[PDB]
Amino acid sequence: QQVTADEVGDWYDKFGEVYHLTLGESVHCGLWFPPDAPVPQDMELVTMSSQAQDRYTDYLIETLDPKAGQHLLDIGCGTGRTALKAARQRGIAVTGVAVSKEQIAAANRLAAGHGLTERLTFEVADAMRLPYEDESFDCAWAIESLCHMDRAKALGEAWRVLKPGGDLLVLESVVTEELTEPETALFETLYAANVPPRLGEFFDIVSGAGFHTLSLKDLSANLAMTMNVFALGVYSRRAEFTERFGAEFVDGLLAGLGSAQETLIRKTRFFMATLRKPAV
C-alpha cells in the first residue's frame, strides 16, 4: 500500500529502461538455474556459483563417460572435488596431480573425509613430467589447467599415460584476435597463466601429440558469466580479501579485472574438447 499505481507508472516511464540496459529485452529474471536444479543451501553468490560448478562437473562426467572400474587421471586436480564427484557417480578410481602443495593436502583431506582414500589418490606432481608409466589410465581430463603449462609437453604426457583408445577431455581457452602486450601480461600477473594459443595452433599441438579430435563445444558464455561472478565478488569484498591475501594482490585484481573481462569478451573463446588416443 506504500505505492500507488500512478507512481509505479511514472517510475517505469522514467527509469524502466535501466532494466533493459542491465537484464536484456524483458523486465524479469533470467533462468540461471535449470528447473530440475535443487534449491541451494543459501542464496550467497558463492553458494550459487558452487552449484553451477557441480552441474558443470556433472556435464563433464557425462561427456567423457568414464565406465565403472576404470581409472581416471585428473590433470591439474585442484582441491579434488571434481575427482570426488566422478568417483562417487561412476564407481571409478581417480588419480589427481597438482603443483600446489596446499591444494593436494586439501584434496587428500577431502578423500579422507568421505572415506575414499582407496579410490582417490592425490599427489604433488607436474603434468609436464608425469610420474606414471605408459598406458596407466583409461581416461583423463585437464579442466582449466593447460593454461598454466607448456601445452605440447602436457599433451604428450597425457597421451603417453593414456591407454590406446582412451579419451582425454580438455577445457581450454583460445584467442580469436591477436592480443596486445598489456593483455598478455595480465594473463601472468592476474592468474599466473600463459596466453592461450590460436585455435589452429592448438589443434596442431593436439595432433602433434598423437591425438584425434572427436568433438569441440563452445562454453564461452559460461566463462564470461563465471568471470562476472568473480569480478562482482572481488569488488564487493575488497576489504575482506585485502586482509587475507594482501592489498597488493587484491588491488592488482581490482585494476586488471575490467581489462581482462573485455579481452575475454572480445578476443578469446573457451571450449570443451574430447581427444582420443587412437587404438591399433
Add this chain to the structure above:
Amino acid sequence: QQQVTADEVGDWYDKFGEVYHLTLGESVHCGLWFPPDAPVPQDMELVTMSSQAQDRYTDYLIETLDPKAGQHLLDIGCGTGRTALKAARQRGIAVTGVAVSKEQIAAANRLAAGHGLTERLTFEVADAMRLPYEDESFDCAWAIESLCHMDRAKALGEAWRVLKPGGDLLVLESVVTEELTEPETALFETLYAANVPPRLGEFFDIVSGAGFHTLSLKDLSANLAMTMNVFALGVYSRRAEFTERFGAEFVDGLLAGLGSAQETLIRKTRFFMATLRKPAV
C-alpha cells in the same frame, strides 16, 4: 612462450587459490550457467547473456502455464511486451497486456507492429486493480513479477473476475520469511517503487480469499538472487553511463541501497512461481 614455470604456478595457488573458493565455490572451474542445448549468444556482454536467460525463463513460464492455440491470455503487468510476443508466436494465442506506464505500453505496441502481430497482441495502459475488461473474458493469465507493485488482494480478485471458470493464472511473487525492519521496508519503495512482500500464509489467504485454488508452487529464489547480482554489477560497473542517462540522484540511490537490498533478499525473502486455478462449473 610460457610466461610462468610450474614452481611459480604452484606458489600462486598456495597463496591465492582460495579467492577462487571464496567467490566461485567448492571447485576451481567455471559454472554451467547456460544449459548445453542453449545457443551460443551473439555477444558475451552481460546484458546479452542475461537477455538469453530471460527468454529461457519466458519459455519455462509458457511451458508451465501451457496456453492452447486459439486461447486469449491476459498479461497482467506486461512491461514492454516481449513475454507476450514469444507466447503469441510459440503457442498461436492472442495476448492482451496491461501496464500502468504509458512508455512501456507504447514500446509494446511498436514491438507488435514491428513483428506484424497487431491483431493478436493488444497492449493498453490500465490498472490491474481495476481492470476495464468484462467478466470471464480470458482463458488464462499471468502476473510475471508485477504483483509487488500492487495491492495483491485487489489485483487477484480482479484477475479472478476476468478469468473464465476453469482457467489458470500464473503468478511469480515474492514472500518474506522474516519480519523486515523499517529501513528494509522503505528500500522497497525507494529503490523498486514496490510494496513489501507478504508472508506465505498471508499470501495464500489472499489467494484463497480471491477464490483461487493453488495447483503448484516452485521456488525460483536462486534465479532472482542471480538476476539481482547481474543488475547490481551492471549498475556498479556503469555508474557514469547511467547517471548521464537517468541522473545522479537515481543512480546514487541504487549504489547506496543495492547492498542492503541484496542481503535482505538473500536472508529474508523467497521467490516462487505459483499456478492458481479459477474453479470450473
Add this chain to the structure above:
Amino acid sequence: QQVTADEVGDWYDKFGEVYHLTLGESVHCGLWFPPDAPVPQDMELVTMSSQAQDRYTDYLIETLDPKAGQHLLDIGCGTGRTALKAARQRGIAVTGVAVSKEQIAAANRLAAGHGLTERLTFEVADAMRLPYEDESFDCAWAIESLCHMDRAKALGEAWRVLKPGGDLLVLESVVTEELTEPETALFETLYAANVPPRLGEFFDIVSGAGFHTLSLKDLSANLAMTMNVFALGVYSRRAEFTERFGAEFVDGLLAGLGSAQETLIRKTRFFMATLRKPAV
C-alpha cells in the same frame, strides 16, 4: 458372426451414452498406466493398484532426492515398503516410526526378509514426541500421515530432528470449503483422522515450525482415483471384509464412503510439498 451391423448401431443409439456418463468424452480405454510400465502379474484390482503405489513411491524418491549414505526419517511409515524401496534405490539408511504395533512388526519382518535390517529401523514412536536427538537425519518425509496427528507438534518435532538444510517431504490434504459437522465427523468415524486445515492455515503452521516452502504440486486426482479404487473394492467384497474386520466396520464404510468421496471431490485438495529447514 454373432451380431449384425444394424443390431450394433441400434445398441449405440440406445445406450452409447452410458460410456460417456462413465468413461468420459470418448468411447475407449483410459491410459491408466504409462506405456513404459510393465505388464503386471495379475489383473486383480489390488495388484494394478499396488504397481501404481510403487510408481507413486518412485516419484517421491525422485522428488525428495535422497543421496547415498544419508539417513532418512519416515514419519508415519506404515508397513515399510516405502522405506525399503528408498533404501534399495538410493543406498540410504531409513528410520520409520508409527503408532501401530502391527505395522511396525510387519515393517521389521520386511527389512529382515530383504536383508536390510542394518539400514532399516522401525519403531513405535510418536511423531509429536519423537525420541531421537536434534539434527539426527539428513531428510524426512510424511506420506499421508499428518492427518492423524497434531500438525503443529509433528512438524516442529520433524524440524527438530532434521539437520539444518534438510528437506522434509509432506503429502497433505487441505480444505477449500468450510466442512459441515457431519463431514468433519466422517473423518474420525471412517479414517480416524483429523480434518485438514486451510492452505493459508497450513503454511502458517509450516512457517511457525521454522520451515521454508520450496515446492507444492497438486495430486488431488491421484487421491480421488485411489479412494475410488478403495471404495470399489469395499463394495464388491463386502462378505469377505465383514468376515475379516466385522460387520460394524464394513457397514460404516458402505454408508460413508459415498458421502466422503463427494466431500473429497468438492471441498479438499491433496498436494506434495517440499519443506526445508534453513541452513546455517
Add this chain to the structure above:
Amino acid sequence: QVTADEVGDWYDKFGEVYHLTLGESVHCGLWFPPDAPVPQDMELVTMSSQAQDRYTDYLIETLDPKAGQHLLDIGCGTGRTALKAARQRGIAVTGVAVSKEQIAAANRLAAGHGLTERLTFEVADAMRLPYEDESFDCAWAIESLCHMDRAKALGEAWRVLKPGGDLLVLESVVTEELTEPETALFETLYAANVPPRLGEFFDIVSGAGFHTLSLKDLSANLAMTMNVFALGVYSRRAEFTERFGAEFVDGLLAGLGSAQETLIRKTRFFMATLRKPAVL
C-alpha cells in the same frame, strides 16, 4: 480430533484393509503422470476422460500420421479421437459408424471446431466401406472390430488403404476358450462378437494381406477402464435406470462381475500396427 493411541489401535485392527484394496503400501497410486494437467474436477468421469485423451494421444504417437494425409476412423464413435488427431497432426479424418446418434454427435464436433472440410463423419458399414480403392494413407479401428466380422472389415480396410500405409488396431483376444455363458455375456452386455485367439486373429490379418509390425499389451488399461465403468454403473443405479430403463441397467449390474473376472483371467487386449505392403 483423535489421539495417537486411537490411531495405532485403528491400524492394528483395520490397517490391512488398505493392503487388500490398494496394494503393498498404504498410500496413493500414481494414476496420472506428474506432467499431466490438474483436471477441471475430480468426478470419476472427468478423470477417466483425461485418461481417454492421453490414450488417444498415445495412439496418434504410435500410428504417427503425417501432415496432409487422410485418416480413416473405422468405428469412429462420437468423433473425439478424430478431432484430436486432426488438430494435432494437420490431417483430414473420415469416420464411419453404424449409429446415427453417434454420427450426429460427431458431426457437431466437426462443425464446432471450424474444421468440417477436414473432419467427415458418415453412417456406413466397415464390412462394406463405400469408399474407393487406395483412398486413405492410414486408418485405425479403436476397439471397434469386436462388433464386426473381422476378415470382412480387415479386407475392406486393406482395399481402401494406399500401398504402404498402416492400420492401427486395438483388439482383444482370448487366452483360454470361454464357456458358453461367457460367450453369451458378450452379446447381452455389449453387442459384440467373442474375441478370437491370437494365432487365429493373425491368420485373419494375414489373409487380408497385412504385415504385422508391432503389438503391445494394454490389458491392464482395459482392466482399469472396466473397473471405472463398473463403479459408475453400480454407484449410479438410479440415474441410469431412469435414462436407459431397468432391464438394461439390471443386465449390467448382474453381468459386469462375471464379465470382469472373465476379462481378467481369460482375455488380453493389445494395440497392433498392420502394414499394407508397398509396391515391390
Add this chain to the structure above:
Amino acid sequence: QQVTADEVGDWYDKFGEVYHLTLGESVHCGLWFPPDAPVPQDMELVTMSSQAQDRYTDYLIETLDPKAGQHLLDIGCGTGRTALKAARQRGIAVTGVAVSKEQIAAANRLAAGHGLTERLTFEVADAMRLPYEDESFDCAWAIESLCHMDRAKALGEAWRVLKPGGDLLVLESVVTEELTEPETALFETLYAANVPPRLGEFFDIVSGAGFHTLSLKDLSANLAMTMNVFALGVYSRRAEFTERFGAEFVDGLLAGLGSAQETLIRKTRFFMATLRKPAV
C-alpha cells in the same frame, strides 16, 4: 585445388545419379550411428558392426529388463558376449546353452577372462531337451536361435524351465509369402537352419507352449542391413575366408548370398517378441 568447378560440374552431370541409385534420394552420408553413440575404436567394417551388435544387445536388455539377483537362461547362447553384457549391466546370473562345443569353450573362456565364472555358466545342451528342472529361471531369451530348432519343442521346454510370471524374449523370423523349394534349400545349405513359419502358425505354437504374447516389434531392416554387412565382408575377403574355411564353404556363400538377400527382402520379416509364462 587439383580440380576445377567445371570439371566437378561435369562429373555430377554424368555420374551424379550413381549416388542416388546406391545411397538414396540425397547425396550425403547415412546416419547409421546415433549421435550419442561413442566413436568406435576403429573404422573396420567388423568393428562398426560389432558396436551395432552391442547396442542391439543393450536394447534386448532394456526390453526384457532383468532385475538384479535373477537367473536368466540364454537359449542358444553363441560365444557368450550377450550373456556377459547382461550380467554386468543388471547384476544377474546367466546360464547359456548351445549345441556347439567350440562356442561353449569360447564362452567359458570369455567368462574366465572377465572373472564372472560364478555368475556365467555355459554348457553344451539341446534347447529341445533342456537338462534343467522346472521353474528354474526367472527369465530367458532365444536370440536368433529358434530357426535352428523345432520351435514347439524349444518353446515348450523354455516354458517348462521358466518360473511362473517370468518372461521369454524371442528374436525370430517369419515368412510373409510362400517359399519355393530352392529358397527353402538355401536355409539349410547356407545357415543350417529351418524355414521360418508363418505369423499365425508361430503364435499358434507360442500359445500351444502356454505363452502369452505381451509385445512384438519389427526389426526386419536391421536383419536386412546385417546381411548386407555379412555379404560385403564375404565378397571382399574371398581369399582370406577360403584359406580359413575352405573354398567349398565360401563358394556356397558367394553363390547363395545374393538369392538369400532377395528372399529375405521380399518374403520374410524379423521381429522381437516378449512371451510371458502366466502367473498363478
Add this chain to the structure above:
Amino acid sequence: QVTADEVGDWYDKFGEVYHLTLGESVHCGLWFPPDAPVPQDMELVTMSSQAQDRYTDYLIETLDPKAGQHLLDIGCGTGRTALKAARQRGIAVTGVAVSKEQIAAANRLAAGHGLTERLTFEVADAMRLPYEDESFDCAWAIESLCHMDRAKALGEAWRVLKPGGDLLVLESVVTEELTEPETALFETLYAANVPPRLGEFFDIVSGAGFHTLSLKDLSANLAMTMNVFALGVYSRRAEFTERFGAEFVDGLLAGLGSAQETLIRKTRFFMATLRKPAV
C-alpha cells in the same frame, strides 16, 4: 530339416565367419534406432535413404534454422536437404551447385512440392558467390567443400552471411599425410581435393573470419556410407556399366577398396558449426 548335431558341427567349423564379419556376437546390428519407422522396402538404397533422411533431420536440429530465415545451401545437389529444411522449419532456402543436371532436378523437386517461392536453386560457384554481402541468416556446406578451394569457399560464405549467422560444415581431414597414389584417387574417383589437416583447416576457418562453435566426429557414418556404396557397385556392376559406361565402373571397382582403407586409416569426418561474429 536340420538336427541339433548338424547345427553344432556347423558352428564348430564355420561359426567364426560371423565373428570375422559381424563382430564379437552372433546376431544382428541395431542399424536403425527402435523409434525409426519400418521402411517401405528392404532394398539397400531404400534403407540407406531413410538413414540419409535421419541424417538431414540431425543437421536441421544442429544448425536450428528459425522460421522466416533465409538459408544458403552451398553445394546443394538435387535439393532434398533443402526441401526437408523448408517444410520442417518454415524457411526460405537458396541452393547453388556447379552441376546443371543437379540444379534442374532440384527445381523440379521444388516445383513438384509447390515450394518454388521458398526453394531457389541456381547454377553457381561457391568460390565466387553471386549474392550480396549479408544476404543470408545461416548456411551449410554438406559434403561439398572437398570439391572447392576451402579458403575461397569459406571466405565467400562469410561474405554472404549476416553478422551472427552460422555456417554448418561437413568436411574431411587427414590425420596422416597421404601417399601420391592415395591423393590421386581423390581426383580419379570423386573429382575431389585432398582434405587438409585439422589445424590447417581451422587456420583457414579463422582466416575466413569464422569462430568455431562446435565440432562432432561423424567418421563411422561416412565409412558405413562408403561400405554401402561399394557394396552397391560390386553387386550391380552390369547395371552401372550399362548406365555409366565400363570406364567409370571399372575405376570404382579398382579403387574403392584402396579408397576405403585410406578413409579408415588416414582420415576423419566431422560436422562443425562456424559463426560469423556479431557486431
